[PDB]
Ligand binder design. Structure first.
Ligand SMILES: CCCCCCCC(=O)O
Length: 336
């Protein structure tokens, strides 16, 4: 990991704007760690389709992620490109289908189902590379622990976490994809509709499924990571909105959290922790701050390059059930 900023960029506490990356001007917010001497572990939280970055950082029901700074983490939170650097934008011009080959507009988190997405089969995209540049620049002003760089988020932010872990597994130490998509495809890369993708995992729940969220094909081996995937239970679903305002089911996070857990659990240098709750599709609601503290400290207990055999899971807060490995309570087992 190298600490460097675009020439002349002056990083500051709080809001940073006009950060140049791949022809775009990006923004992000920095909360330096509290009560920490020396390099601090890093948390890069990402909002979803409708909550603003400020909501994700400061509103309790959205996770109040900036509070992890009070927990000893330097929080570096990116603003979505679609928000045009405004951390208060919610769903305006963000909550909807993507353009330029991207599937969904909040983040560059998955290739679209039509051929315009072809190019993103093996190019991480501008958000994944921006986040690396962002953290590398902040690290010139604040002492960051290069073995404890973690990112994570909810919904589309969870999808982005999955993408970033798959394309930058030699940078991040791990992540927290909460109710993110995998955009399951056939083994040959063919995009599947929501319904067909949902059925593909139900038909082979323990297999590693390809997906538009990542490289095609997915990498045979990723760098060392700890990944904690969170499913919100039976109601962890998303209904999209048509131009006329009507709603329709367009995502089910049971197959996508399962698929992500299957891929990461099979990786030899990855510790995968599968967590289930019952709060639905939104930031964890039960004992929210206890969960954020437990989850980030669990990730930090496995610094990059740590032996997976040395990992020891501790009990999560009331309202969560977690274990190392793939999800097991989402689909009936083979042996049953
Ligand atoms: C084309 C359908 C994509 C659904 C994305 C759902 C994003 C969310 O859960 O915030």
């Amino acid at each position: 990991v190298k600490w460097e900023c675009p020439a002349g960029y002056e990083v500051k506490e709080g809001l940073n704007v006009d950060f140049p990356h791949k022809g775009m001007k990006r923004a992000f917010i920095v909360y330096p760690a509290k009560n920490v001497s020396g390099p601090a572990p890093v948390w890069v939280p990402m909002t979803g389709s409708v909550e603003s970055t400020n909501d994700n950082l400061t509103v309790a029901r959205s996770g109040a992620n900036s509070i992890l700074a009070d927990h000893g983490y330097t929080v570096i939170a990116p603003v979505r490109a679609c928000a045009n650097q405004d951390p208060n934008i919610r769903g305006e011009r963000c909550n909807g289908p993507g353009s330029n080959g991207w599937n969904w507009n909040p983040w560059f988190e998955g290739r679209a189902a039509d051929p315009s997405g072809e190019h993103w089969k093996n190019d991480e995209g501008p958000d994944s590379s921006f986040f690396v540049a962002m953290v590398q620049c902040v690290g010139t002003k604040y002492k960051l622990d290069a073995r404890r760089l973690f990112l994570g988020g909810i919904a589309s932010g969870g999808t982005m976490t999955n993408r970033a872990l798959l394309f930058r597994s030699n940078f991040w130490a791990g992540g927290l994809p909460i109710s993110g998509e995998w955009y399951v495809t056939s083994d040959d890369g063919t995009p599947l509709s929501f319904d067909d993708a949902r059925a593909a995992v139900a038909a082979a729940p323990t297999k590693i499924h390809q997906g538009r969220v990542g490289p095609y094909p997915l990498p045979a081996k990723v760098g060392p990571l700890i990944v904690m995937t969170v499913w919100g239970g039976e109601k962890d679903l998303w209904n999209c909105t048509r131009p006329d305002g009507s709603r329709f089911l367009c995502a089910d996070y049971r197959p996508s959290t399962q698929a992500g857990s299957n891929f990461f659990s099979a990786q030899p240098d990855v510790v995968h922790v599968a967590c289930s709750s019952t709060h639905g599709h939104m930031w964890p609601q039960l004992n929210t701050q206890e969960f954020n503290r437990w989850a980030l400290d669990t990730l930090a207990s496995h610094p990059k390059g740590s032996d997976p055999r040395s990992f020891k899971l501790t009990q999560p807060p009331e309202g969560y059930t977690c274990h190392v490995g793939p999800f097991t309570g989402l689909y009936a087992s083979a042996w049953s």
